[PDB]
Design a protein around this nucleic acid. Structure first.
Lengths: 177, 248, 60, 117, 159, 312
RNA sequence: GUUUGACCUCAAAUCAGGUAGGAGUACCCGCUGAACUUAAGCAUAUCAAUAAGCGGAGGAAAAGAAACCAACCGGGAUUGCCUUAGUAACGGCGAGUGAAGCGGCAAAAGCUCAAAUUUGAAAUCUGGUACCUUCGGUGCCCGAGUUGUAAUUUGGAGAGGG
RNA sequence: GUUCUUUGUAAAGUGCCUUCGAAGAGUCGAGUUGUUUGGGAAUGCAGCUCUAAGUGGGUGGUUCCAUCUAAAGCUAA
RNA sequence: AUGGUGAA
């Protein structure tokens, strides 16, 4: 439906329409706290394509971070400490200033019974996903860990400490090679 | 205060139904009384009763004098009454909404009764409804101390009954009820003695329940009262007895 | 006698007091229930019916 | 289909009887809700019960008629600093009894005894 | 300073035209959750013991409306001006102008919510109509095109 | 003790609903008894006023919207609070109830003689006239009368409802000038309290001593007089007062109000025949006229004071 | 209507239901990061993508169904072992540093969203409450939810009908 | 194995014929300052500036050809 | 050197 039009509207970022929305919102988000809850995602098309359903249990925290370790991961880490019961799913850029950057990190309540039911999202309830951001298991964390497929990512594919310990410790068999 | 253009046309077109509605009735009962039937709709007197499944027993009307209690209603929507209905409602002094009077139904009364049908509701009451109306509401326009008569105040006494009427055997308030329930000769004098009956309105307020109860009851008028608008429209009778429980 | 009386007045109603619930451990008081874990998406239930994991042997 | 499927489920439930049709629910509410206050329930302040009048009436011995000066003196005095709530009158006949103008107030003042005292 | 596609809103539909729009639209309420449920229990009680045509209502989802304009199925489209992300609906007056579907910017989002059994709606559209209100609908189309479109032809310009 | 300003803040209900509840228990400041208000806060009537308030927000958002269909649903699925569980705390023994029913009929017999206004609902009034004639139905049936007193104020009565001399002033049948001072909010809540109180007692007097509660009514007798001769009654002496007028058939006439006077003769036992019923075997006719006319030998012509002299 | 009513937002409470902290820490996942020591003094190479410190998990963790490797009569998620190999490659070519594809094996399992309308009917869920065969089911009420919750689809295509 | 109930113009699968048929942006990329490596085609990452396309785009092989579909997520051994 | 404990 509209998500194609919004998808293409969000492309032209410095264009007249979206330029004006930035300068109003950048002022408005400075009035509010560092870490605070938005009731609805400002870029809802982006929220969806990062796994947000507009049902009870999903929370959109807006977060402010300084400019000049990665800022996206710091943004997720800040909301992780404040909203400890929640689990960080994904985050995205909304607006930026000369001094600050804003992200609208999306969260899921594993304790809320609307999530413990449906099988599309009940995986986040499993204790292996406590603080996904504190281990770099989010989108931006996996990006900064250099975890992809290719010749580029040879020395850091399946854990950069794991491949180091494998390469720099002697291995001996019962009947020596 | 300002008038929207929606209003003045709706008021125009509704009254110019009623200016057309009574014109036809005033032509008809002229031709009924003067007896020049070559082209009429109907040739007799119709009284319909609407009670409860929502029965519509249409009747004739013989010459037998009956007793009707008539309550002023405020209908319809945009209707400035014409000159011909200002008069009858002023001669019955029913110019206030939610105000009643007993009258007698003759074949002199019935033709004028088709004039005011959309503006009031009529009907035959019961003796309880005769009695419990008067001993619970009753106004007497009578002299105050020295000057101020028009304090209409209250049927307090039975000796004020001795005062004004008195000499017609009119001795007590229960005796008045004899003169109304039975067609007596001094019926019009005592009818001229109890000028309104300020009935209360049913809904009587704004509010939570009051908005809803207004809406739920307002449609109930639209079933228990239909507006015929016909040349030989019947006169519609409702039960007064169930109505007075709503109004007393 | 007090505890059995409290259990009788909270006979099979949702959210009875914390001092009467099973201790077990902390992790097992979190973590999805039998129903919640076995809860499967509607598509997968159809794919289970249409193509279930069949039983077979291989020779003759 | 959707509504057609949904009906079929509500058909199924009344086939299993989990659900009552709305016409019988009125019949469940017709037998109920008239039977209200119609049951046995039985099987410390003395509430200051009112003083019983006997022989002060519409047709009294007429010395109980107030003196004509005290008529206005009863009127000129205000309420509650006041002995009678009325002035008795004389009526030979049952018919001549007036509209007892202040009976509404007599309960409204009594009502304030019932809880404020 | 406002870029012309923003503040193409706020130059909204006036008093009398908006009143007449709701005089039409309030006739076409979607059947509410309670009303729909009781109807199906009536169907259950009747059809289990012992035909209907397609009923017209307003269409009210943003995805549904953006479908219907460009389908093309929408005739009148009402658009609220107050929207939390304004960018959700900024393209929508242009889409209607491009496909030639008559549109009107209405004032108040909750005002759309009242006619539709929701809190807010942002967009509402009337795809199809009963035969009696067909002439009235087409008259309102012309009324809206005269008042909204022809008066504010310069709404695409001026900051 | 606590303060009047404290308890409303404490209870967190309407102040009117504080005053409305305070009538119901019967709590009076000696100042406010602090345990008793703490005793009040766990009571099921307090459940309903919060719910009756939150009904009202949920309804005005309904009609404010304009979905009247949904608005209409709220009423049919809306409870009423009963006052049964205000009674048994307050009236432990039924003979204690009949020593407080003094004031109860003293209110409720007033309200039958009332015009319906905007302030007072007629349903209450048409119950009140119904309850009065329900009261008089049992009283006139089993002849339970002792003393009478007609006075300037109204007409007092006296009867041993299992021996307690109840006294209930029936006012005179006239239009009553409703004064601007009075409050039909406090008085109605008394009636509201007293009405349900009067139901159980009439159930008690019927279904334990006498009859079935309530008996059906006869409509066509109610069309004539709308009083005590209607409202017919079906089940399923020691005093000479109860032996009065035993097979003494009377005629009553249009001078007296029959309603105040047919009661006593039926409470005694004589038969009552009116002039008013149309709209021999009788041997009495009560008249208030300087000019009497018919004067037959069979009828005995007594002014009605003497009938009140027969009782006292 | 100088009332009133919708919403949105900000509140509130010793309300109802929850949840997060701390300990342990061998393994794992992140973050931060020396020096003695090696080539001749020390800026890289080198101790060392170490130790300490910080944060976070589990019975394993992490990884994972290709924006992959290849140059062949192509392979086909990931992880580990053997081998490729001390090879390519880099390193004041020196202290030396040090892979990977293929091949053999261990174990093998795939799928879910977002994406164009259920529009002839939000088909969905929370909670309260009443019962029942209680890791739950059902009726009723309430709220969420059209700024989109269900069903149908994920490129291996798929959907509409016949 | 033993039963009790299975329903609704219900839920799919397969082959043929016909009509359509959308796949993630402050991201890819670009310059530079640091960090990472033994990494020679700054590999990987971060910071800062600017910031795309749809018979598209990413990666490799001597003028084409091969190979996948990023910028979302789950998953035992 | 890292981390900590004490301190006219």
């Amino acid at each position: 439906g509209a998500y194609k039009y919004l998808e293409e509207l969000q492309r032209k970022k410095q264009s007249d329409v979206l330029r004006f929305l930035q300068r109003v919102r950048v002022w408005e988000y400075r009035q509010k706290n560092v870490i605070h809850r938005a009731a609805r995602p400002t870029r809802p098309d982006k929220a969806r394509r990062l796994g947000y359903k507009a049902k009870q249990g999903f929370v959109i925290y807006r977060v402010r971070v300084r400019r000049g370790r990665s800022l996206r991961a710091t943004a997720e880490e800040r909301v992780g400490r404040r909203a400890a019961n929640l689990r960080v799913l994904n985050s995205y850029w909304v607006n930026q200033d000369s001094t600050y950057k804003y992200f609208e990190v999306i969260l899921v309540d594993p304790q809320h019974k609307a999530i413990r039911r449906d099988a599309r999202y009940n995986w986040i309830c499993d204790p292996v996903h406590k603080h996904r951001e504190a281990r770099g298991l989010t989108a931006t964390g996996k990006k900064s860990r250099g975890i992809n497929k290719g010749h580029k990512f040879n020395n850091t594919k399946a854990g950069r400490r794991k491949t180091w310990k494998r390469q720099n410790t002697l291995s001996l068999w019962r009947y020596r090679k | 205060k300002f008038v929207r253009a929606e209003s003045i046309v709706a008021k125009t077109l509704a009254t110019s139904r009623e200016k057309e509605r009574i014109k036809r009735v005033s032509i008809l009962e002229d031709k009924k009384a003067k007896n020049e039937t070559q082209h009429i709709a109907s040739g007799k007197d119709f009284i319909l009763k609407i009670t409860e499944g929502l029965i519509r027993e249409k009747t004739t009307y013989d010459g037998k004098p009956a007793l009707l209690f008539i309550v002023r209603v405020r209908g319809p929507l945009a209707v400035n009454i014409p000159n011909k209905a200002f008069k009858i409602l002023s001669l019955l002094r029913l110019v206030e909404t939610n105000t009643g009077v007993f009258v007698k139904l003759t074949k002199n009364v019935y033709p004028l009764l088709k004039v005011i049908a959309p503006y009031v509701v009529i009907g035959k009451p019961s003796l309880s409804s005769i009695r419990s109306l008067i001993q619970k509401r009753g106004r007497i326009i009578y002299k105050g101390e020295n000057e101020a008569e028009p304090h209409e105040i209250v049927l307090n006494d039975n000796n004020i009954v001795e005062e004004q009427l008195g000499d017609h055997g009119i001795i007590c308030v229960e005796d008045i009820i004899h003169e109304i329930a039975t067609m007596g000769e001094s019926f019009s004098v005592c009818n001229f003695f109890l000028q309104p009956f300020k009935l209360n309105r049913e809904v009587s307020g704004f509010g939570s329940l009051n908005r809803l109860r207004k809406i739920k009851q307002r449609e109930a008028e639209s079933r228990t009262r239909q507006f015929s608008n016909a040349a030989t429209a019947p006169v519609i009778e409702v039960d007064i007895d169930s109505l007075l429980a709503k109004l007393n | 006698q007090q505890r059995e009386a409290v259990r009788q007045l909270y006979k099979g109603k949702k959210y009875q007091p914390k001092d009467l619930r099973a201790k077990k451990t902390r992790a097992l008081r979190r973590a999805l229930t039998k129903f919640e874990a076995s809860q499967v998406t509607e598509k997968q239930r159809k794919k289970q019916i249409a193509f279930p994991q069949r039983k077979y042997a291989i020779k003759a | 289909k959707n509504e057609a499927k949904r009906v079929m489920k509500i058909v199924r439930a009344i086939r299993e009887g989990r659900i009552i049709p709305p016409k019988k629910l009125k019949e469940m509410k017709e037998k109920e809700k008239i039977e209200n206050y119609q049951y046995d329930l039985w099987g410390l302040r003395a509430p200051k019960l009112p003083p019983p009048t006997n022989e002060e009436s519409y047709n009294p011995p007429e010395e109980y008629l107030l003196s004509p000066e005290e008529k206005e003196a009863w009127e000129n005095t205000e309420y509650s600093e006041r002995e009678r709530n009325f002035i008795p009158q004389k009526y030979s006949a049952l018919r001549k009894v007036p509209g007892y103008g202040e009976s509404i107030r007599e309960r409204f003042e009594r009502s304030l005894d019932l809880y404020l005292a | 300073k406002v870029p012309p596609t923003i503040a193409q809103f706020q130059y909204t539909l006036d008093r009398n035209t908006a009143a007449e729009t709701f005089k039409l639209f309030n006739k076409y309420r979607p059947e509410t959750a309670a009303e729909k449920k009781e109807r199906l229990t009536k169907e259950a009680a009747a059809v289990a013991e012992g035909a209907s045509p397609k009923p017209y209502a307003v269409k009210y989802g943003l995805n549904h409306v953006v479908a219907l304009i460009e389908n093309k199925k929408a005739k009148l489209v009402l658009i609220a001006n107050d929207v939390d992300p304004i960018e959700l609906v900024v393209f929508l007056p242009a889409l209607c102008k491009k496909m030639g579907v008559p549109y009107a910017i209405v004032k108040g989002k909750a005002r759309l919510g009242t006619l539709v059994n929701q809190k807010t709606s942002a967009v509402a559209a009337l795809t199809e109509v009963r035969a009696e209100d067909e002439a009235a609908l087409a008259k309102l189309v012309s009324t809206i095109d005269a008042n909204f479109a022809d008066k504010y032809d310069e709404v695409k310009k001026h900051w | 003790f606590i303060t009047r300003s404290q308890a409303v803040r404490k209870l967190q209900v309407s102040l009117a609903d504080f005053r409305r509840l305070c009538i119901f228990k019967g709590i009076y400041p000696r100042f406010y008894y602090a345990k008793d208000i703490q005793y009040l806060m766990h009571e099921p009537v307090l459940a309903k006023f919060r719910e009756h308030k939150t009904f009202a927000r949920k309804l005005t958002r309904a009609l404010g919207r304009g979905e009247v269909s949904s608005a209409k649903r709220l009423e049919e699925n809306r409870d009423s609070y009963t006052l049964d569980h205000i009674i048994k705390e307050r009236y432990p023994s039924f003979p204690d109830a009949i020593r407080d029913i003094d004031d109860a009929l003293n209110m409720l017999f007033l309200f039958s003689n009332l015009p319906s206004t905007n302030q007072v609902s007629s349903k209450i009034i048409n119950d009140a006239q119904k309850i009065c004639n329900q009261w008089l139905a049992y009283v006139a049936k089993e002849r339970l009368v002792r003393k009478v007193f007609v006075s300037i104020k109204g007409v007092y009565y006296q009867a041993n409802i299992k021996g307690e001399e109840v006294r209930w002033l029936v006012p005179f049948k006239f239009p009553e000038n409703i004064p601007s001072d009075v409050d039909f909010r406090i008085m109605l809540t008394f009636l509201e309290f007293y009405s349900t109180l009067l139901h159980f007692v009439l159930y008690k007097l019927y279904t334990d001593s006498g009859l079935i509660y309530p008996p059906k009514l006869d409509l066509k007798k109610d069309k004539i007089i709308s009083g005590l001769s209607s409202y017919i009654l079906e089940s399923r002496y020691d005093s000479p007062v109860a032996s009065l007028f035993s097979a003494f058939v009377f005629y009553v006439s249009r001078e007296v109000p029959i309603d105040i006077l047919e009661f006593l003769i039926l409470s005694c036992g004589g038969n009552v025949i009116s002039e008013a019923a149309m709209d021999s075997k009788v041997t009495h006719q009560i008249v208030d006229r300087p000019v009497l006319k018919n004067k037959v030998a069979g009828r005995t012509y007594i002014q009605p004071q003497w009938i009140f002299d027969c009782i006292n």
